[PDB]
Design a protein around this ligand. Structure first.
Ligand SMILES: Nc1ncnc2c1ncn2[C@@H]1O[C@H](COP(=O)(O)OP(=O)(O)OP(=O)(O)O)[C@@H](O)[C@H]1O
Ligand SMILES: Nc1ncnc2c1ncn2[C@@H]1O[C@H](COP(=O)(O)OP(=O)(O)O)[C@@H](O)[C@H]1O
Ligand SMILES: [Mg+2]
Lengths: 512, 7, 523
């Protein structure tokens, strides 16, 4: 009857005195009853559990490198960490220490890394997105069900959006999954539907998240891998190599009629969207392709639709956002600082006006208090150095000073752009024009030093996009210049400075 | 077997 | 017995084998037991499910737009989107990816688009209201072992429509409720999932049912859709309606429906366009045409009541002048241009969520000490733009003909006249400067000029937001000339033709263009 099926897979012996136990109980009951449907169901939900038939995991790392690079462009540090995990996985046959975690903003491909790792390690992929036998009939647990459906002993498992799993409501506690994650409690994981201990060792675990808002029994076992925002050349390379063909195949556009140029994609990235990932770019590209299909059905005269940087106002609407540019057309009494944010980088022009007055100090432009403190520190640097800069030292009581930053109703805060405001103060006090080709970043102190800043790469990509040629960084950020693409290094004349004298020597067009 | 809604 | 319906139903092989197997559980038990009623009702549910009955989808796009244009006036981006959809499924069979979503304020007509899209696509219409559902069993039902059990509303509406490939209008996603023991946002994620459509696995119908062919149009008022569901949808935000297209919704859709609704025969009530424009301007504010529909409805009721209690007149002509006798006193009002040039008054432009309106900016500087006061319920960005424009006027002061020691000897007051309305933003920047210059020079601002744009210290006029409402507002208030930042002129291609043809729009880079155009005398 069913004995050749229960011996056909060669289940372990404990589960076959259980399975033969309900088989000899099944010999002493009626076939047509619903209790026999529970019995046959309990037999069926043990002969689908993968007690054997492992997948041969792959050990070489060059073919794993390219089969990671066949579906994702620029997650190089993540791919490094995965090849290192496959190196210790190659030596140690069973890694049961901590668990890989992919923290990053939505839009980067942390979920499809389960696919690239899934066919990169060679094992099978089961995805779990988190966000007892009886008369009425019961399904097995979710953790076991994925395993049975996959039917393999070594299946990669993903815990997606644990940041969205633990809500503020009564739901799943940390117990039923840290008993899955811990090494000593996985030799006997007794599922409540089957009451048979099933092993969870040699099962790779990958968990993805958008922050470190993870429950405290789980954060102990999760290696936080960070995934930074994509730059514009990387978004162009992701749109052109991986994202246009999937929209072409989900829209059935054969290759002869639609041409979306590179200036079109860069026009979408710069002018039409603001995010860290490439999801909104795919809403724009999908809208572009379906407008191409509509423009082929509604007009049978033309057949090839050419889309470039000019005709993205015929499609997609009008330009929603915009970025800042270098004001290279003149050199005036303002500076161009650098601003960092989650979406990327931005130029940040800083303006001063110094009229005769009583010495009123007005700061304007939704400035945070740390920025206003940096203006007061920079003005103290100017007052301490008033004679040798050529300034009449009574300007504290004879000239009113206004510091404005143009994008009002935009909250701006941070210790950076202190030397930029010091340069603008020296400029508007001396009448010496700041050269427009120079962007600036740094933090000023009263002695005249330049302290380090953060987010140097996005400031350098903002300055490279803006048309800046010369960037003044602090000295202790030379280290961060070890992770800039060499086209940006080759185009920007980066000067690491350490004082305000090195700043005013370069940034002012006349000597002081 | 009959379902029953609890508050 | 009933094998001819199991065979003639043409089910998939798993549904066929377990229905035939369940009938071969049925035909050896007594028909008066409970189990024969359970499996008999289950067989009847399995027979009334549309396994393969599929409706034909339209392929024409001219006639589909003719269908869409006879229910709704001006949802042109949504109608274009549905024509893109019908354009794409003339190549592929089933659309994969996200579903449609219609987000908007109440009254914009995003629920009554369900029959319009179902007619324009030739698909059968099913609506399911999700405004207060708490349990998953409205989506997934209960098991067969329960006594009063049945499928959820999904399978029951598929059987109610009797045809696979319908159109769904998930009516209110943002109003669903959470509860213990189940949550219909998870089950609704199982509905909307493209890799779980073919295997739905309802609790009563343990078979898998294919839901990949069903169209999904969901509707909401806000972006408060849950993140498990909001990342599977395509948000199409329906904005407010302008006064001209509210007039066209009223003329073409609301007036015959309310004449038919209050049973008005031909020639006993007429309403011209001046009365309707007086309703839109003077009696309603909201974005949508539901309150306009109510005011038209009460015009019709007062027409009926004034007819059957007079019996002498048989015709009532409502226009913009006798509307006070019907609706009453004008509840709201809009700003208008001044009729003569004032010496400290500029017309700013403002944007709200129901449209735009003319601001007035009134400055007055008197002989005083150095002191400077701001009134009119101003935000910090607004006041901060005022003092930014003030230091624009303190620089270049001898160029403007201003005595440059004025700030130590004049008291400057800046006041927007509404008082109780909070007014914030930088967009009243280059207007503000102008008024200051005017009160410091005695040069009267010409009253035909509206101004918008934030100002910087060197004089540049940086862009704004919400231009179309400001241009429609200025065109409403008798303004002839408006001043705009230069790189907002792109938005000039999305303005109607009469507003462009009736306004004298000047793109402006620097504050000297503003002072050259907006003042009466040369600076
Ligand atoms: N553009 C339009 N043309 C003609 N009629 C319209 C238009 N927009 C709305 N209507 C009418 O307004 C009425 C109310 O619309 P509907 O009930 O769809 O509003 P809604 O946006 O769904 O409101 P809520 O979001 O509060 O449910 C409908 O009967 C519809 O006929
Ligand atoms: N480096 C990349 N190369 C190719 N495609 C990418 C890359 N990064 C992101 N994507 C695309 O962006 C999408 C992001 O979606 P996904 O990662 O599944 O959601 P989440 O970001 O919430 O985890 C993916 O479908 C993927 O196709
Ligand atoms: Mg509605």
């Amino acid at each position: 009857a069913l004995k050749r099926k229960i011996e056909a897979a060669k289940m372990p012996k404990d589960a076959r005195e259980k399975t033969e136990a309900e088989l000899q109980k099944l010999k002493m009951m009626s076939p047509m009853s619903a209790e026999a449907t529970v019995v046959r169901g309990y037999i069926d939900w043990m002969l689908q559990v993968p007690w054997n038939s492992r997948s041969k995991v792959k050990k070489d790392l060059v073919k794993a490198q390219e089969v990671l690079d066949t579906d994702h462009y620029g997650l190089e540090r993540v791919k490094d960490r995965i090849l290192e995990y496959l190196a210790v996985q190659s030596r140690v046959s069973k890694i049961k220490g901590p668990i890989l975690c992919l923290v990053g903003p939505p839009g980067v491909g942390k979920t499809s890394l389960g696919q690239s790792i899934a066919k990169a390690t060679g094992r099978q992929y089961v995805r779990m997105a988190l966000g007892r036998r009886t008369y009425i009939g019961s399904m097995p647990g979710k953790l076991i069900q994925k395993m049975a459906k996959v039917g393999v002993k070594n299946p990669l498992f993903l815990l997606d959006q644990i940041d969205k799993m633990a809500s503020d409501m009564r739901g799943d506690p940390a117990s039923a999954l840290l008993e899955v994650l811990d090494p000593e409690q996985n030799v006997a994981f007794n599922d409540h539907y089957l009451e048979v201990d099933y092993d969870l060792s040699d099962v790779m675990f990958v968990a993805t998240s958008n922050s470190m808002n993870i429950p405290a029994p789980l954060l102990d076992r999760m290696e936080v891998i960070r995934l930074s925002g994509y730059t514009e050349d990387e978004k162009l390379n992701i749109a052109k190599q991986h994202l246009l063909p999937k929209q072409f195949e989900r829209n059935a556009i054969k290759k002869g009629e639609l041409t979306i140029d590179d200036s079109a994609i860069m026009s979408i990235i710069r002018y039409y969207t603001r995010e860290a990932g490439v999801r909104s770019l795919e809403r724009e590209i999908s809208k572009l392709c379906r407008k191409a299909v509509k423009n082929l059905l509604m007009d049978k005269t033309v057949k090839h639709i050419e889309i470039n940087g000019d005709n993205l106002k015929d499609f997609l609407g009008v330009q929603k956002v915009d970025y800042g540019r270098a004001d290279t057309e003149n050199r005036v009494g303002q500076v161009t600082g650098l601003a960092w944010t989650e979406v990327g980088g931005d130029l940040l022009t800083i303006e001063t006006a110094c009229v005769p007055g009583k010495g009123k100090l007005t700061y304007t432009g939704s400035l945070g208090e740390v920025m206003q403190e940096s203006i007061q520190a920079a003005l103290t640097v100017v007052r301490a150095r008033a004679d040798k800069l050529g300034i009449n030292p009574d300007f504290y009581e004879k000239r009113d000073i206004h510091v404005h930053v143009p994008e009002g109703a935009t909250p701006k805060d941070g210790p950076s752009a202190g030397i930029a405001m010091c340069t603008a103060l020296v400029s508007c006090l001396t009448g010496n024009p700041v050269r427009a080709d120079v962007a600036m970043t740094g933090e000023i102190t009263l002695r005249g030093l330049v302290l380090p800043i953060g987010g140097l790469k996005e400031k350098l990509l903002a300055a490279h996009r803006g048309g800046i040629k010369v960037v003044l960084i602090p000295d202790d950020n030379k280290r961060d210049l070890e992770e800039i693409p060499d086209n940006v290094i080759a185009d920007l004349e980066i000067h690491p400075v350490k004082r305000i004298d090195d700043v005013l020597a370069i940034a002012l067009e006349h000597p002081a | 077997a009959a379902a029953a809604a609890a508050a």
